[PDB]
């Protein structure tokens, strides 16, 4: 979460854009595939292992 | 790994994508780095492809 220069999307924004593009592409190319999104390093936690 | 095991279908390819911009997430503690290395090794041995 930081902008090294102006008019430059942050790394988090770039990752979100890439994830959205992959999701959209998978919707059309092969909708039977499985996709998951996991975030690490956040104060809140939500896992089956309760890590 | 737990998320992959949860799915009940048959996965031709199991893949993980890491979106990080830190060279040394574990530089202060060597034990954590070794644990991460071994866990990645077993994940690769299982058949999970990490990018």
């Amino acid at each position: 979460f930081e902008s090294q220069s102006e008019d430059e999307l942050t790394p988090f924004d770039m990752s979100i854009q890439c994830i959205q593009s992959v999701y959209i592409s998978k919707i059309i190319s092969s909708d039977r595939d499985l996709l998951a999104v996991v975030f690490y390093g956040t104060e809140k936690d939500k896992n089956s292992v309760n890590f | 790994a737990n998320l992959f095991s949860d799915v009940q279908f048959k996965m031709s390819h199991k893949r993980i994508m890491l979106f990080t911009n830190e060279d040394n997430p574990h530089g202060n503690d060597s034990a954590k780095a070794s644990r991460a290395r071994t866990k990645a090794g077993d994940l690769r041995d299982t058949g999970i492809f990490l990018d």
């Binding site: 992959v22 592409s25 998978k26 092969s30 | 390819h13």
Partner: peptide, 23 residues
């Protein structure tokens, strides 16, 4: 292995459509 598409493994990444490009 080379040229594989990161979205659909097992299918080579098709080159983008170019149309007509006169020489």
């Amino acid at each position: 292995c080379p040229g594989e598409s990161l979205i659909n493994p097992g299918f080579k990444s098709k080159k983008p459509a170019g149309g007509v490009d006169f020489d």
